[PDB]
Structures are given as structure tokens and as C-alpha cells.
From Swiss-Prot:
The gene is PIN1. This is Peptidyl-prolyl cis-trans isomerase NIMA-interacting 1. Pfam families: Rotamase, WW. Residues 35-146 form the PpiC domain. It comes from the Eukaryota. Peptidyl-prolyl cis/trans isomerase (PPIase) that binds to and isomerizes specific phosphorylated Ser/Thr-Pro (pSer/Thr-Pro) motifs. By inducing conformational changes in a subset of phosphorylated proteins, acts as a molecular switch in multiple cellular processes. Displays a preference for acidic residues located N-terminally to the proline bond to be isomerized. Regulates mitosis presumably by interacting with NIMA and attenuating its mitosis-promoting activity. Down-regulates kinase activity of BTK. GO terms for molecular function: beta-catenin binding; cis-trans isomerase activity; cytoskeletal motor activity; GTPase activating protein binding; mitogen-activated protein kinase kinase binding; peptidyl-prolyl cis-trans isomerase activity; phosphoprotein binding; phosphoserine residue binding. It is found in: Nucleus; Nucleus speckle; Cytoplasm.
């Protein structure tokens, strides 16, 4: 039972059971339910410890890692509440020129991407979204589209 990476937990505030994934950092109340290639979109928030602390939006990225996590956490909130489309937030705020494609990164096999990014992408099912995903480039929201 439970697909790869998925676990069961309990809210400390309500005692209600929920489900979460260690590889993707996704979490949800609903019970969840390997290809050669996957296609994902992403939204990257960089921080001052990113490998290259620079992006098309900002010549020198100054924010802290914890500050980047709070932006990512707020963007996920906007996405899950339906206040904002994933594509609209990536186009505007992703610290990566994949923003021009609304976050699309194309299709890729294993062996190309940063490993935690790769592991998260291949643990997502088509249509699913990650929680914060930590890599040397910063913090990612990943959306698997194929």
C-alpha cells in the first residue's frame, strides 16, 4: 500500500490522518492513489547560497534560504487555494529562464538533473505537484506534466 515515497501521518492540531511524501515533500488529506522520461514544470526561488545567486529577475540574489522557503510555501498556498495558477506564478517569480515557458523544463530521463530534483520528478505521477524541493540551485515547486 501507498505508492513510492508516500507515508501516513497525524495532524498535531486535529488528530486527523494525512498523507505525505518524503521524496517530493507533498502533503494532502487524501490517500494518494517507472517511465523512461518525465516532463515537468517548476518554479525556482533562489537564495544567497544558490550555486549561482543570480537570475533574470534579480542581478544579485540576496534573500536567505529560510526566506526562499517562505515564498515557496506561500506560492504553494496560492496554487492549492486556486488564487493563482502555477503557470502565472512561475512566469513572474521563478528565478530561472524556464519562466519564459511558464516553468516548463521539457522531458528528461534520469542522469541529467540534480539528483533530488530528479528523484522528486520521477516520484510524482502525471498531474501531481511537489512540496518544496531542495537542490543546489535553491528551492523548487515541481509540477509533472507528462
Amino acid at each position: 500500500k501507498l505508492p513510492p515515497g508516500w507515508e501516513k501521518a497525524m495532524s498535531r492540531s486535529s488528530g486527523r490522518v494525512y498523507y505525505f511524501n518524503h521524496i517530493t515533500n507533498a502533503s494532502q488529506w487524501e490517500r494518494p492513489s517507472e517511465p523512461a522520461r518525465v516532463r515537468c514544470s517548476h518554479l525556482l526561488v533562489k537564495h544567497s547560497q544558490s550555486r549561482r545567486p543570480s537570475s533574470w529577475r534579480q542581478e544579485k540574489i540576496t534573500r536567505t534560504k529560510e526566506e526562499a522557503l517562505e515564498l515557496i510555501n506561500g506560492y504553494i498556498q496560492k496554487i492549492k487555494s486556486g488564487e493563482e495558477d502555477f503557470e502565472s506564478l512561475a512566469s513572474q517569480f521563478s528565478d530561472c529562464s524556464s519562466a519564459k515557458a511558464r516553468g516548463d523544463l521539457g522531458a528528461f530521463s534520469r542522469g541529467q538533473m540534480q539528483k533530488p530534483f530528479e528523484d522528486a520528478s520521477f516520484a510524482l505521477r502525471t498531474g501531481e505537484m511537489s512540496g518544496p524541493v531542495f537542490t543546489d540551485s535553491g528551492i523548487h515547486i515541481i509540477l509533472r506534466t507528462e
